Amino acid sequence: LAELFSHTHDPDAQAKLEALTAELLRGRGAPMQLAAQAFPGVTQQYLALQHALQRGEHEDAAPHALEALRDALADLELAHGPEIRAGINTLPTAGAFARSADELAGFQHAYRDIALGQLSLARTLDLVLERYGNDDIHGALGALIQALGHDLAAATPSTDGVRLQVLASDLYQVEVAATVLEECNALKQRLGCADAQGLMRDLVGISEDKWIAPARFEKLAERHGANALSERIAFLGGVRQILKDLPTQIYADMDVRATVLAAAQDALDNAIAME
Ligand SMILES: [Ca+2]
Ligand SMILES: [Cl-]
Ligand code: NA
């Protein structure tokens, strides 16, 4: 258990756990609060409380202090059982990807929301863009898929095997999409928070807009400073190309995709017609 905290990549991880253990067994503070102050992520908190309990029993700690740890562990299992299972099952993978305690917890939170949520492909893509968009988005996705594999490999996966298999296929589509969306960098660079990352998330939003119309693309253009006629045409042309290459599975459905692309084309043509 103590060795598992090496995955935080905190040079004082071990000392911190031992200090926390002493504080927990001292029995003044609320176990859950103390654990959360020491380590981010319920997975690390759960493991720390478990470590303290085992030590406390062997060390012959106060029965009341031990009981408080048992209650805390039981509360966490009841409220966050699947999340903790997901974290435990994927710790080696998460450890290999994360470079700090915050990055570890961050990865676990992303994995939790995907694995245990009911997110559409678009919302999953948006989640990944928000967290990893201007960092190692492809590394994050590859690690998430490794995590899905380690979860399914475990004796008790965090959710059903059928769902984990579907999620691996979903995340492949997200990886294809994330690659396509890199074109937003070049587009913003050519034309000159409404940055490239913002545009990527804007396009993903558009992919689930069943009420999409050409007017929405005008507002997008305005948001991104493509106001002059030439830049407006170039921007709308770029956006349509990117939307077109975005995998069909990202869109709310095939019909919404068709509407989006027809609207994007019309917005482009309207701008061209002004020239
Ligand atoms: Ca004794
Ligand atoms: Cl289509
Ligand atoms: Na990878």
Numbering used by the authors: 83 to 274, 281 to 363
Extract from the study:
The T3SS of bordetellae is a multicomponent protein-export apparatus that injects effector proteins BteA and BopN directly from the Bordetella cytosol into host cells. We have solved the crystal structure of BopN of B. pertussis and show that it is similar to the structures of gatekeepers that control access to the T3SS channel from the bacterial cytoplasm. Moreover, the ΔbopN mutant secreted approximately 10-fold higher amounts of BteA into the medium of infected cells than the wild-type bacteria, but it translocated lower amounts of BteA into the host cell cytoplasm. These data demonstrate that BopN is a Bordetella T3SS gatekeeper required for regulated and targeted translocation of the BteA effector through the T3SS injectisome into host cells. Proteins that prevent the premature release of effectors under secretion-restrictive conditions (before contact with the host cell or without an artificial trigger) serve as gatekeepers and are referred to as SctW in the unified nomenclature of Sct proteins.
To obtain a stable protein fragment of BopN suitable for crystallization experiments, we performed limited proteolysis of the full-length BopN protein (BopN 1 to 365) of B. pertussis Tohama I by trypsin. A stable protein fragment with an intact mass of 31,869 Da was obtained corresponding to a truncated BopN protein lacking the first 68 residues (BopN 69 to 365). The protein crystallized in a tetragonal (P4222) space group with a single molecule per asymmetric unit and its structure was determined with a 1.95 Å resolution. As shown by a ribbon representation and by a topology diagram, BopN is an elongated protein consisting of three X-bundle domains. The N-terminal domain comprises 5 helices 1 to 5 and includes residues 83 to 161. Residues 69 to 82 are not visible, probably due to conformational flexibility or partial degradation. A kinked helix 6 (residues 162 to 180) connects the N-terminal domain to a central domain consisting of parallel helices 7 and 8 located on top of helices 6, 9, and 10. The C-terminal domain consists of parallel helices 11 and 12, overlying helices 10, 13, and 14. It is connected to the central domain by a shared rigid central helix 10 (residues 243 to 274) and a region (residues 275 to 281) that lacks density in the electron map, indicating loop flexibility. When the BopN molecule is superimposed on the structurally characterized gatekeepers, the overall shapes and orientations of the X-bundle domains also differ, with the most noticeable difference being the realignment of the N-terminal domain of BopN.
